[PDB]
Amino acid sequence: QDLYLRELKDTKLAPSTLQDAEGNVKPWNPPQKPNLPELELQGPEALKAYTEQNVETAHVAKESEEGESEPIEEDWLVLDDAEETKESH
Amino acid sequence: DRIDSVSQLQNVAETTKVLFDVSKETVELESEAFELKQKVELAHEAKAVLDS
């Protein structure tokens, strides 16, 4: 149909100008290529953790806590304390 | 009654040290879960970056 074919033409070659050709758009002043492709590509990381989300900051798992291998001082006091607690058993 | 005071300790020497070890080494096994949580959190962070 002419109304279909003409619509397809005006909506395809112009769609070519918008997307399929890097001619941006004459009717609209700011091209989306200088707006979306790189800066708004940081919009994904603007919503994400910037230079940190894609990066995934290095955080190595640490060691758990222990008694510093100290039986010279902790063992005797622990024994006395446990025996004192045993006085009401 | 002295015998009775001795009666409780009879079946306790069987597993006092066994519990001392079971509650010690298995608790010592928690560094694996810690490091695995670390990697899982890194996976969550990167996966969220990908989702963004």
Distance from CA of B32 to the nearest CA of A (A): 10
∠ CA A9-A11-A14, rounded to 5°: 95
Q: Which of A52, A64, A66 would best serve as a mutation to test chain B binding (most B beta carbons within 10 A)?
A: A64
CA–CA separation, A36 vs A54, rounded Å? 19
Specify the resolution in Å: 4.2
Contacts of A42 in chain B (CB under 8 A): none
Q: Do A54 and B46 touch (CB under 8 A)?
A: yes
Q: Which of A86, A64, A67, A66 is nearest to A75 (CA)?
A: A67
Q: Do B34 and A57 touch (CB under 8 A)?
A: no
Measured between alpha carbons, how far is residue A2 from residues A6, A13, A15, A56, B9 in Å?
6, 16, 18, 56, 102
Question: Do B11 and B18 contact (CB within 8 A), yes or no?
Answer: no
Q: Do A45 and B30 touch (CB under 8 A)?
A: no
CA–CA separation, B13 vs B10, rounded Å? 7
Give buried/exposed letters for A65-87 (b at 16+ CB in 10 A, else e): eeeeeeeeeeeeeeeeeeeeeee
CA–CA separation, A48 vs B27, rounded Å? 36
What experiment produced this structure? cryo-EM
Contacts of A48 in chain B (CB under 8 A): 48-49, 52
Distance from CA of B19 to the nearest CA of A (A): 16
Q: Do A44 and B42 touch (CB under 8 A)?
A: no
Q: Which of A54, A57, A75, A79 would best serve as a mutation to test chain B binding (most B beta carbons within 10 A)?
A: A54
Residues 6+ apart with CB under 8 A from B25: none
